[PDB]
């Protein structure tokens, strides 16, 4: 429900330790939780806004030059001097013209010249820093209710949208029928602001690095500045043409709007149009589940004769979704759904919409369950008029675990150490692989930075070759963790 059909979602089973589980959820993915009890839920971020921004440094995309005055003087007599050189709107350059009697000075030497031209921006581009307070994630929680026409249902009032901040608290949600659920989240560790500059073009916006935003070659001007005319690095937007040794002239240098839309390759786009809405990054959330009523206990079973009203349809990751409908009397009741096999003894193939329930009306319900990797019977009731639907799920033998190995590794490529916060206190193994991934990813971070798509692959080839020639058992040291991992990182970047 609202997760079924979204690509690259993931499942978590287990509330072990106490009654909690650690999940980290991006804007794209949609994590689904399961337990031995404790009805299933669907979480994902929908929105992340920075509330109150403040400008850091305004740059200058496009300028124009007016009021050109030049001044040139005799050879071996000092330098020129002009009244508008005192002002700092004007841009200036000293250079050498050659002079003689035809230029009316004497001495036949190479004299001085200045040229002034005042600088006027007409297209700004400002970036706005925000601190890791006062920013408001919004996380939506939808249980697998089996409510009618609500599956793949990214719209519509069907779940609970709770808005968490670091100003906020436990932020518990009483999603009705099933009880309350509390999310102890960390809205500071994840996206790592105070290196982010919420850049802004005319009608666009990006999330760029701070230190990248500071040293751009455009003429700039400090953030809090009314009368924005004292541009500081004006030398990189005008060029001084002194073609021969005759006099010189000034020209402005176009628009770097398109020249910066190439510079913003690799920068993830955000939306600063009405509120600074971001759609990037993750949010680690400890989820404890000790007050989840199941909404369907204390109800009796059915008497049978269902009616499948929408065809069984598998999704990605190999889970069917059916839609049945009760016929009869005694309508608030459970559903005798079970998947089993040929020869009809072994119950195999579990559920994801655990305890399906007919919610007191003639409203069709939605059941998701994971069949086995071959032929299977999917039984939707009891002996007077049950539904034995046949099904075959493709492949899924050892291809499933070699698929979730690659997808877990790409979760370790997109996320950093936070991909070890996907389970619930492994302890002896998880809490130490977290730290070893923080030091291997730490000394990997103070290297390979600025290095592109291709050059990570190239350094992977180099370390692979040096490992494949070196001796004293450094082959496994130099291929496994560096010589191959930097090739896989060399493929799985430039998202």
């Amino acid at each position, epitope marked *: 429900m609202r997760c079924i059909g979204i690509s690259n979602r993931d499942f978590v089973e287990g509330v072990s330790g106490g009654s909690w589980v650690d999940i980290v959820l991006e804007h794209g993915s949609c994590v689904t939780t399961m337990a031995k009890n404790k009805p299933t839920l669907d979480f994902e971020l929908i929105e992340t806004e920075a509330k*109150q921004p403040a400008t850091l440094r305004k740059y200058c995309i496009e300028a124009k030059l007016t009021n050109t005055t030049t001044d040139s003087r005799c050879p071996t007599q000092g330098e020129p001097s002009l009244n508008e050189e005192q002002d700092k709107r004007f841009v200036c350059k000293h250079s050498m013209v050659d002079r003689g009697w035809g230029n009316g000075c004497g001495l036949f030497g190479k004299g001085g010249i200045v040229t002034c031209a005042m600088f006027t921006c007409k297209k700004n581009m400002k970036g706005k820093v925000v601190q890791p307070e006062n920013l408001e994630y919004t996380i939506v929680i939808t249980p697998h209710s089996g409510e009618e026409h609500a599956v793949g249902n990214d719209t519509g009032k069907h779940g609970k949208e709770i808005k968490i901040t670091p100003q906020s608290s436990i932020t518990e949600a009483e999603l009705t029928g099933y009880g309350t659920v509390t999310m102890e989240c960390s809205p500071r560790t994840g996206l790592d602001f105070n290196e982010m500059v919420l850049l802004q073009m005319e009608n666009k916006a990006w999330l760029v690095h701070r230190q990248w935003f500071l040293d751009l070659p455009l003429p700039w001007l400090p953030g*809090a500045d*009314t009368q924005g005319s004292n541009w500081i690095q004006k030398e990189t937007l005008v060029t001084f043409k002194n073609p021969h040794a005759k006099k010189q002239d000034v020209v402005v240098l176009g628009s770097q709007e398109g020249a910066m839309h190439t510079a913003l390759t690799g920068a993830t786009e955000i939306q600063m149009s009405s509120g600074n809405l971001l759609f990037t990054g993750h949010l680690k959330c400890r989820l404890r589940m000790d007050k989840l009523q199941l909404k369907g206990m204390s109800y009796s079973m059915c008497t049978g004769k269902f009616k499948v009203v929408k065809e069984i349809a598998e999704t990605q990751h190999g889970t069917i979704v059916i839609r049945v409908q009760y016929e009869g009397d005694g309508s608030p009741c459970k559903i005798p759904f079970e998947i089993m096999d040929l020869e009809k003894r072994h119950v195999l193939g579990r559920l994801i919409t655990v305890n399906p329930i007919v919610t007191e009306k003639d409203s069709p319900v939605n059941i998701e369950a994971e069949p086995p990797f071959g032929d299977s019977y999917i039984i939707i009731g009891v002996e007077p008029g049950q539904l034995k639907l046949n099904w075959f799920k493709k492949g899924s033998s050892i291809g499933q675990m070699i698929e979730t190995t690659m997808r877990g590794a790409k979760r370790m490529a997109i996320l950093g150490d936070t991909a070890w916060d996907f389970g619930s206190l492994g302890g002896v193994f998880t809490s130490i692989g977290k730290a070893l991934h923080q030091v291997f990813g730490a000394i990997y971070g103070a290297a390979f930075s600025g290095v592109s798509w291709i050059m990570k692959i190239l350094i992977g080839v180099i370390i692979t070759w040096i490992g494949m020639n070196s001796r004293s058992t450094s082959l496994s040291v130099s291929l496994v963790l560096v010589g191959v991992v930097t090739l896989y990182l060399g493929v799985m970047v430039q998202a």
Partner: antibody
Amino acid sequence: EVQLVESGAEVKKPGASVKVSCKASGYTFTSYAMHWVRQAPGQRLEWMGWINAGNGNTKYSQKFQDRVTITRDTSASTAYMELSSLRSEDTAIYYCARDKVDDYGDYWFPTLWYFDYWGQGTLVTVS
Amino acid sequence: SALTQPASVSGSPGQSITISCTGTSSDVGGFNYVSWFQQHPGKAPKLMLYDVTSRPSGVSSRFSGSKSGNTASLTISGLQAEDEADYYCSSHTSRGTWVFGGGTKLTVL
């Protein structure tokens, strides 16, 4: 416990030199700051006076930069405020202020609770 | 160099009234030097709020202030008959001068 009385002015001429004082008592005058502010009736509080101190420093307010000269004194524990070259809009009510100075002597960083106490108002006219 | 509070507000005794002031990125929206001064028609004004929200002695703990970006709000809960003063605003700027509000007029009927 802190009261700031002033000195009154009867009638002036546009171009003459009005002058207003402030007898401050009940506290230590040698290490606090004294401002002066003008209020046209029902209008904006135009901040006239500057950042006085134990040595009487200045901070040039832009609208009243080349038309006011202020002094002080310590032996009388008062502050001085005189405005030369009046015109037909300077006729308004005056007030005073109070603020503590940093312990190193200098006062550019103001403190959080500025403008603790005020004057009482001495009205000036033109003719 | 000025402040943009509305010239006249009204409200019955019992409801709440708020007065906002839009400042630039140097005087109000950047710094926590935002003060509020009322003025009786026969009395000199007096200090009423500290840096953002905090209060001196004297006034009876009703007035709360806030800063919502470039706006500075003065919340008044439980109006009375002796509160018909001129709630000015104040801000220490970045260069070193003090700016002030134009003026609010308050009634109850």
